[PDB]
């Protein structure tokens with residue numbers, strides 16, 4: 001009856017994981033917006 | 046004003062140390078005493094005391110890296126010498 | 138109340154340099170901070186008066202420093218006091234960065250004061266490096282090429298950043314003219330980081346060499362540490378006066394007096410004596426990408442040091458072996474800057490790998506394990 | 521062999537914290553520059569006025585700068601015309617463009633010596649030992665490329681600068697013997713002046729600054745101890761309070 | 766940062782083992798006097814940093830007498846240190862006066878704070 005912890009719980013890391021991927025996806029969308037006009041990044045744009 | 050955080054120092058009046066009691070202090074005005082009173086017997090006997098304590102903490106740590114650099118410098122001098130090119134080609 | 142405490146502007150001066158409570162037993166190693174504040178003013182003041190005679194064009198950059206040295210009234214005093222004060226700035230800063238590591242100043246609750254110092258440490262390296270290319274000497278052109286072409290190791294992005302930083306295809310007029318305008322800006326950022334540096338120093342105060350609480354015996358800053366700081370100010374301005382009037386070109390390199398040439402390289406591209414050791418860490422790794430990661434980590438390894446130290450005592454004063462390996466690390470760095478002065482030849486390459494390994498292992502293996510037995514020798518030796 | 525032979529320390533008269541230049545040697549060194557090393561080397565950073573009151577008198581310098589010619593502002597219809605030099609102008613080099621220097625000297629670029637003393641490691645000792653350090657033949661084992669002379673002090677050994685210093689190639693205005701060792705001691709003195717024309721004033725302002733600062737530094741120790749005298753001899757006693765409270 | 770209970774379970778085992786308590790304890794006792802804090806009048810537990818909530822809790826439970834004396838040894842060491850000298854030989858700390866007076870308070874405070882963090886993460890079946 002004890003969960004692995006370091007002041008951060010294992011249960012609380014799996015609860016935030018779906019949102020962490022969504023925040024990661026929201027960050028890539030912000031990268032293409034702010035790094036448009038870069039000719040090298042236009043290879044996949 | 047806005048509230049502030051919690052620190053480990055106060056100011057004159059609430060410095061934040063433990064309560065003290067039973068400790069007394071004496072002092073004398075510097076207009077009434079002679080400075081430079083013991084500069085000799087401190088430049089000779091006191092300095093020698095401190096040196097004899099903390100000098101093997103600095104010498105042996107400096108005694109290892111001096112022989113390590115010298116046996117590399119006098120080895121690099123032979124490897125690039127006319128008598129030490131044959132050892133140079135086996136390490137080059 | 139008194140006017141020095143009631144006024145809005147004079148109350149900030151009162152609580153920082155006049156009524157500030159200091160530990161009563163800090164030795165001369167704690168005078169180093171005020172010497173860096175003195176040297177920051179020297180660089181700026183001797184720089185504003187010398188910026189009135191300098192042209193940042195690639196055509197006039199070198200020629201204008203000679204005009205400062207030959208035509209400006211007391212123009213040689215300006216440039217020797219500014220070129221030697223840059224070298225004296227780093228020697229006091231290393232003795233400030235080393236006193237902190239010896240007495241365990243990085244430990245909590247002063248970790249932010251420790252991290253702001255590392256930010257200050259980097260910005261000063263850039264500021265000195267940027268002002269070094271302003272002279273446009275033969276050593277500064279090739280010191281600019283090597284350092285700036287270092288970011289070509291970041292994959293898929295490096296070639297554009299390097300071309301963006303140079304302002305073109307190499308080091309030419311667009312490079313120097315923007316290096317000078319940056320060199321005038323960064324000292325105003327350091328001056329702003331020092332203000333944030335003294336703000337984190339004021340919440341908890343200075344430490345003492347005993348490594349114990351200092352709230353039991355305090356004395357005011359004025360008339361005690363104002364006049365004790367005056368002792369080292371006059372000694373700092375005396376040794377600086379010897380290097381400025383009696384031997385001005387001892388610390389520098391004679392190749393910087395040649396105009397920069399893009400066709401012919403010097404016999405040996407070497408950095409200044411304060412960046413010399415990290416040059417050996419870069420050159421120890423037999424790869425290009427891995428060199429940058431290893432070179433920059435040596436600055437960033439200082440950041441984990443509040444976590445690796447597992448001791449319940451601050452400092453090295455009451456520890457025989459933790460005080461013992463410190464001086465090897467001190468000397469290993471002193472040895473580390475020695476190979477960088479020598480060419481890349483047998484057997485300096487082999488020395489270059491073992492020495493930089495022991496450099497990194499002090500933070501990551503020795504400081505954590507010796508600090509561990511030391512807790513045990515302390516425990517059974519008393520029990 | 522490739523670092524170049526280390527040159528020893530000689531007995532220069534201006535070394536030491538109180539010595540000035542021998543201004544008689546600056547006057548003589550300027551004479552052997554104009555007739556020996558004026559042909560292939562430049563001095564572009566020396567104005568004419570700096571020679572007044574140091575090596576020559578004012579009427580002497582206003583005539584030396586008039587033997588040359590400078591380009592003047594155009595005439596009434598824009599045609600170019602020349603003017604004689606004045607005291608505000610600089611010493612003209614021997615070659616107009618960098619290409620014409622390399623043509624006369626087999627492709628080698630002869631440097632500008634207005635900063636040579638502070639730009640070659642070896643200070644004053646390296647210029648002196650350069651022009652007198654030429655052996656009559658290269659050491660056994662080495663065959664030099666054509667057109668290049670051997671000199672051990674030069675890093676790498678082989679150099680493109682020949683021998684220019686012989687005996688009695690110049691006559692002095694004060695009867696000094698013109699030996700190869702004598703002139704080489706003089707040009708290095710004149711060239712050190714060119715690189716450091718602030719030499720004498722710097723060393724006498726330093727004596728003023730050191731004496732002022734060294735007694736300020738000592739006076740501060742007395743004042744520090746006078747003001748710290750009440751804390752240095754402060755004495756504490758401890759008497760344990762009763763546990764009744 | 767290596768706690769204190771962690772390095773004490775190391776201690777009581779070495780003390781009880783006859784081979785270990787004969788090999789290293791005779792080497793540990795020279796490490797204490799070579800450290801040389803005894804000569805300025807300092808008991809060991811006065812050397813530990815106190816700027817964390819664990820030590821601040823134990824410093825409050827400390828009795829008045831041991832807190833008043835603790836105040837004097839720190840003041841004496843601060844005063845003696847600024848003079849670049851040492852205490853007279855007849856006032857140094859001996860071997861027997863250096864006792865663990867701050868040990869039990871540190872230990873009773875970590876086991877009550879270990880319990881708190883092991884109860885904040887209970888996964889009930």
Ligand code: HEC
Pocket residue numbers: 553556557558559560561625628629630631633636640647679680681682684707711
């Ligand atoms: C005959 C032409 C000539 C004369 C006369 C001459 N030099 Fe040179 N000097 C050269 C050339 C050519 C070079 C370039 C050689 C090279 O660097 O290999 C050179 C190079 C030098 C250098 C550079 C050495 C270095 O290590 O890079 C110095 C210093 C120098 N000369 C000093 C002098 C001095 C001092 C004099 C007389 C006072 C003098 N020269 C007279 C032709 C001359």
Ligand code: HEM
Pocket residue numbers: 177180181182183184185187188191202216219220223226264265268269271272320321324
């Ligand atoms: C911490 C602050 C500063 C540092 C460390 C610094 C450092 C340097 C260094 C090392 C050089 C090259 C010196 C040489 O070898 O000749 C230099 C040159 C120069 N600096 Fe600074 N500098 C600082 C601030 C300033 C400021 C604020 C200005 C102007 C307002 C300034 C103006 C110059 C100029 C004009 C040069 C070229 C002139 C010359 O050195 O000949 N500097 N600086």
Ligand code: HEM
Pocket residue numbers: 166167168169170171173174177230233234237242243250251253254255257258331334338342343344345
């Ligand atoms: C211009 C640059 C700097 C100035 C003016 C400056 C100034 C100061 C001052 C006045 C203090 C308090 C007095 C003292 O402890 O001696 C201090 C403390 C400190 N500084 Fe700096 N500092 C500078 C740069 C740095 C750097 C580069 C670092 C670290 C890399 C650093 C780390 C520290 C630390 C750890 C302390 C606390 C020392 C202690 O309390 O014992 N500082 N600084």
Ligand SMILES: COc1c(O)c(C)c(C/C=C(\C)CC/C=C(\C)CC/C=C(\C)CC/C=C(\C)CC/C=C(\C)CCC=C(C)C)c(O)c1OC
Pocket residue numbers: 153154157170171172174175177178181182185186328331332335338343362366
């Ligand atoms: C913890 O204990 C402390 C402590 O708290 C403090 C504060 C200090 C003191 C240290 C400092 C406060 C250092 C502060 C340093 C700076 C902020 C740098 C200062 C920077 C500037 C002044 C900015 C630049 C601006 C100028 C100087 C402009 C000058 C104007 C010129 C040249 C124009 C002249 C032209 C004409 C027309 C005459 C200590 O020394 C100390 O330990 C003893």
Ligand SMILES: CCCCCCCCCCCCCCC(=O)O[C@H](COC(=O)CCCCCCCCCCCC)COP(=O)(O)O
Pocket residue numbers: 171172174175360363364366367370
């Ligand atoms: C940031 C750059 C400096 C770092 C801080 C170091 C502190 C040194 C500042 C000097 C002030 C000392 C005098 C205090 C005072 O007013 O005392 C006054 C009067 O004292 C005097 O007699 C003044 C002596 C004159 C010496 C000043 C020389 C200055 C040297 C230049 C230093 C900075 C470039 C108060 O005296 P009191 O002790 O009775 O209160």
